[PDB]
Structures are given as C-alpha cells and as structure tokens.
C-alpha cells in the first residue's frame, strides 16, 4: 500500500566504544568473545 | 485488578517487484511488444544463409 507503518521517529545518540568486526563476505560481523569479559571469576559456567 | 493485552508492533514486508529488463537474462531475447497477436493467425520467418 507503500505504507509508512513500522517505524520512522527520531535518531537516537551515537557512542564509540572497544569492539572488533571482521569482513566475512559482504555481510560484515562483530566478535565478542564473553569469557574474560564479564565471566572473569563468577563461578557461573560459560555458556 | 488491572489485565490488559498488549499489540507491541506490527510488520510488513514488500512484494519486491523484480523489472524483467532490469535482469542478466534480458540479452537472450529481442522481447517485443506486438498488441496485435490476438487478431493474427500465424507468423513465419524465412532465412537467407
């Protein structure tokens, strides 16, 4: 119906941080590894 | 008591209309518009090698 439905509202605010992303084809992807980062000495197993 | 239900968002997609020149294939075929098949009998080509 070229409806404008969904969602159009009011661009959020932008921050930089640490990360890592990596080129796997044209679909460009993140790498988090979630043992040293919030896992560090928990006693709950990773996942 | 207070109970409510909640329609949280709602989605669509588009039917993508694909364009049949606007496609690799379109050179395999001199695609022509001829209004007037409906009125002919028949065609022939001849072919002088």
Request: with cysteine; hydrophobic share 45%.
């Amino acid at each position: 119906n070229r409806e404008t439905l969904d969602e159009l509202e009011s661009a959020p605010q932008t921050t930089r941080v640490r990360a890592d992303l990596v080129a796997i084809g044209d679909r460009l992807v993140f790498l988090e590894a979630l043992e040293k980062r919030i896992y560090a000495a928990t006693n709950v197993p990773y996942p | 008591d207070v109970e409510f239900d909640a329609l949280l968002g709602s989605y669509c997609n588009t039917l993508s209309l694909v364009r049949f020149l606007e496609l690799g294939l379109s050179v395999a075929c001199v695609c022509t518009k001829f209004p007037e098949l409906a009125y002919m009998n028949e065609g022939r080509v001849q072919f002088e090698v």
